Design a protein around this ligand. Sequence first.
Ligand SMILES: Nc1ncnc2c1ncn2[C@@H]1O[C@H](C[C@@H](N)CC[C@H](N)C(=O)O)[C@@H](O)[C@H]1O
Ligand SMILES: Nc1ncnc2c1ncn2[C@@H]1O[C@H](C[C@@H](N)CC[C@H](N)C(=O)O)[C@@H](O)[C@H]1O
Lengths: 306, 296, 318, 318
Amino acid sequence: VSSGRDLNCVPEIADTLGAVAKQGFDFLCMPVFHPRFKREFIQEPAKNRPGPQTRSDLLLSGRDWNTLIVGKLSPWIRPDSKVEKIRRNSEAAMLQELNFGAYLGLPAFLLPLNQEDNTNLARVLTNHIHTGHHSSMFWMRVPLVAPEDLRDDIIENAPTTHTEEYSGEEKTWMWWHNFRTLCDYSKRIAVALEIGADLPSNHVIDRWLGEPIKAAILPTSIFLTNKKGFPVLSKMHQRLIFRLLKLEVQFIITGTNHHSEKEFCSYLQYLEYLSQNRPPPNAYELFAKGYEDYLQSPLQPLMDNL
Amino acid sequence: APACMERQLEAARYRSDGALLLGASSLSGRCWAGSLWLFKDPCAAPNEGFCSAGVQTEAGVADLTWVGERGILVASDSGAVELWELDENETLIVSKFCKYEHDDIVSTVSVLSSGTQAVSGSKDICIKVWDLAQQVVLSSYRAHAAQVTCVAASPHKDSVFLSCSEDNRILLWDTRCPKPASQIGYLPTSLAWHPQQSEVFVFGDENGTVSLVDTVLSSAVHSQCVTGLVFSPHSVPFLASLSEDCSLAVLDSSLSELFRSQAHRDFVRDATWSPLNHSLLTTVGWDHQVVHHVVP
Amino acid sequence: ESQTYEVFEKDPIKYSQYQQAIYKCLLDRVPEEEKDTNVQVLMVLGAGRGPLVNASLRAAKQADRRIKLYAVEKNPNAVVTLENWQFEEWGSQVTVVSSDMREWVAPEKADIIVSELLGSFADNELSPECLDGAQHFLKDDGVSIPGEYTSFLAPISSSKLYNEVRACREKDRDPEAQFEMPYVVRLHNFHQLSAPQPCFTFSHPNRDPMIDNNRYCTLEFPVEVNTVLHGFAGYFETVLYQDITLSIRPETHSPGMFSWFPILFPIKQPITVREGQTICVRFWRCSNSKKVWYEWAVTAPVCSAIHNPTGRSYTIGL
Amino acid sequence: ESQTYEVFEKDPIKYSQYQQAIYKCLLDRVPEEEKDTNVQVLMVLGAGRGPLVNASLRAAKQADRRIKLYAVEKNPNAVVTLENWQFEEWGSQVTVVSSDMREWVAPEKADIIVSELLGSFADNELSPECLDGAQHFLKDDGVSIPGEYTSFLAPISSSKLYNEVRACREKDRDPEAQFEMPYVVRLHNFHQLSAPQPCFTFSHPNRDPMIDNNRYCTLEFPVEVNTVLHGFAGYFETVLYQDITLSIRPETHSPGMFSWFPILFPIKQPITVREGQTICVRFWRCSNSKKVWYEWAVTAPVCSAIHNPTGRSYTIGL
Ligand SMILES: Nc1ncnc2c1ncn2[C@@H]1O[C@H](C[C@@H](N)CC[C@H](N)C(=O)O)[C@@H](O)[C@H]1O
Ligand SMILES: Nc1ncnc2c1ncn2[C@@H]1O[C@H](C[C@@H](N)CC[C@H](N)C(=O)O)[C@@H](O)[C@H]1O
């Protein structure tokens, strides 16, 4: 199974890559600029901050940048902010980070869809795409369940909605749909679907059925603990993993170790166990292999000689 | 004792005897780590050869706080909350605990009135209450819907603290309640409890406005995000406001401007009033400057 | 071409408005006591064949004030007309300058800069960029005529215009390029779906340290009928001086002025709109060192694709 | 991209030639008596990831002369590499400048300007325009490395390459656009029909009042075999300093240097050529304020159409 480690802290690139490779991961999702290093592009004296703006491309080989690294947009970048100053610095920073990723020859780059209005994010991404070729992927980080919808009911004067909202439970699908409609169905824009502790109702899940899912993000926090103390998944989470394996998605492990007594590689070991113990494929699934969604001209044996 | 202190200074805090604690990160270049420093001679800061104590941390320092007279509680990029302690000679900063409990960068930290408990906030959207002697998380709260920007413990109410987030909420917390949080325009970015009036606090926003809240009075102080708000040690306190606009402002009771400093060439990150001379105010910034302001 | 200038010159309302504005500004800058000593430096920036130069001269005679004129024009063919007018009629009072206003090194500073660089969507002929480049040779207390302009948008239904735009497909270009560009058009067989709202505003002089002509606007249009959205009609308003204005926005349209027809911003796909629903549109004004362009998208009741991304179908040359 | 710079850096011959040229120029500007007092200002214009900066440093150590370096680079991604190298290894001796060389306000004047802005047809990456814009911050007795470059053309026969070019027809553009643009290509299955001849030459510094980078050349190629003309192969030669040169022209090709493959200028229609006949070709180097381009035509034994008129199919952005 193809797996990646998601980190938001990289003290040293070579040491982090090395520790992540030792755990059995095929790739690392990481910030290409320090996630706290907010940059100013217009106002003096901060616009004139001495460089380097980030770490050197020379720290890894070109092959390593092309195969082992998925880039991440800085968390302060807010192109759809209601503050004009924040919006303009964010547009310039988004371009700068996407351009550094293209300079590095990164195979993929992660961007979040964490709110309803991503119009300006879409606009800045579309302009980036129409500047060269690159072929590089953009993975849109979108959760099954919105963070406002999974918050604890611990605010005494602002309770959580205990009413079923059929279309509202499906709100993150509409965030993705509007984003990809604005970007005009670019082949370079795909879904990195974030799985939560409590899976939504079936209807909410299968809304994603024919969507271009390229990655599935598993927070360490959604794992239960078995008798021996190792991280495991609920039967329903296992069902979802098996459906995602059928789509050949890349699996991403995010978060800190919540099973301290165990080595961190135990999250990946469990995932690799599920991959190994998946229901086997039939004679049709075996024949059809390599032809999945591959378009062909219907044969015309009357008009043509086969 | 590190040979070199990282450029991006993140924190400055004076303890009782007037010794200055510094927090630094390297936010660019090869290595993205941090350091903790003690300067019994604050004039000598940030010169490495003139520190009382210094230590290298695993990752960057996003925030810190004194825990009594010898304890240093750190918010790390790694997702860990770290507790450091000065040795008997106060010549070494030694690790006590490093607990990786947050799933993303730990953005904010505050000691509660008891001095035995701490509150942390993170980009992972969770708020955690810590038992400092047991080195464990007592409670983990997912009340917010976005990144937690600031946590500020009440001056004298042990179970009370404030939090603010990018989800546009300012939450008032009391852990004695079954539902501990209570909700009280532009995103809130900084919080400060009034040191004398138990029901009063100030909050700063992403647009540069500082506001007075008596659980209103507002002033457009900065041209950019209000990073921090620090009250003076006076009987009648003054308020220090610091911003990404690279300036420091000293405000009176009615939020009127008394002092302004454009000394910093980059983002102003912390402000600390000297316990020795109450008219002195030290700021640290990403320009690597430790400035000592003589507030009139 | 010569005949495009002739067509502009057929509008007497536009020049009488410019003359009235210059007349009012000259009286506010020079009092009666100074009328015979104080000579006001006036620069016509983009003088064309000279109707604004003549309007400034008539304004000065009306105001009983003294002016020194500079007539700046980049089009060398229009400069032939100008230099012949200067020699035969204007004389030494007018200095004809064959130059781009952004490149021109002025011998003196101007009290008043006069221009008519406005399109049907106000700023679509790049009047902000041109005036920003000429701003440095205006005195500190200097006046720009026009002082301000504002564009307006209104959602429209027109199955005829959608069909007309569609038929503009061309060989050797993107098959949908025709939907990603504005059209100047006297809108006839159409339906305006909601009242026009302001889109982009520009002020002159631009006394701001962070000069940025880029813009991003979100407009919410309440719709009271069931319909089909085929595009957006664009209009403008300008303040020449104080209460002296020019408008093509229908509710404030300058009486008898025919210099500008509305502009049409199409959409690739017609959008069904129900009564009570809001049409939400996003417009961007974008640039680089060589080109300026518009980008647009509908986000409500349903999303459209972003039209003209990176100016792939339509640009305005700098 | 980072990997394009890595590919450039794999050529040791090119940098050892640059180092030898800088080494020779430093000895000619500073005698032994001044070696410890005289500090030569060296500006690397288009420093990329820094191999020329390192070549200048090795040259100064070799010459036993003192240098002060400025590393100018417009690509902000390459500036990340530069500023990290400066902090970790170079130190204060090197000042990294994130700027276009044509826009940069220099604090000091340079004794030597070093650059590698050359394409396979020498001037096709716009090295003349870039160096012309940077010329003002070079001392009066200042040296440019390279001092000169010359492009060369040779008529070629290749039915394979004609077929390869033909197959480059694209959707949404002129159906013959592919024949109106040059291609960088390692020419293999072809026939060179006549010896290469000089086409365009540039010198640095350009000590001429009437600076014009536009050019018009007529080349007469004697042909000794019966054949078909499918296009023109382009090469170049450059003088770094005195006898230190770089060449891709086959008869003088720099040994073991792989940084540049030849360039191919196709023709829309194959032209029959008889033994004893002369091939006559006309090449133009054209420009405006925003773009530079080539135009070309065969006038003998028969006329072709003028290829790439007004840069309709191919331009080089300024
Ligand atoms: N940057 C520029 N510098 C000089 N002239 C310009 C510039 N931009 C536009 N123009 C000229 O300004 C004129 C604009 C015309 N549409 C108006 C002509 C004339 N002022 C009239 O009202 O009839 C043209 O003659 C343009 O060539
Ligand atoms: N006008 C300009 N101002 C600054 N840098 C430029 C300019 N034009 C081109 N460059 C840079 O010059 C470099 C040209 C490169 N092909 C050579 C890189 C490097 N000097 C080497 O030999 O490896 C690129 O890094 C360009 O971005």
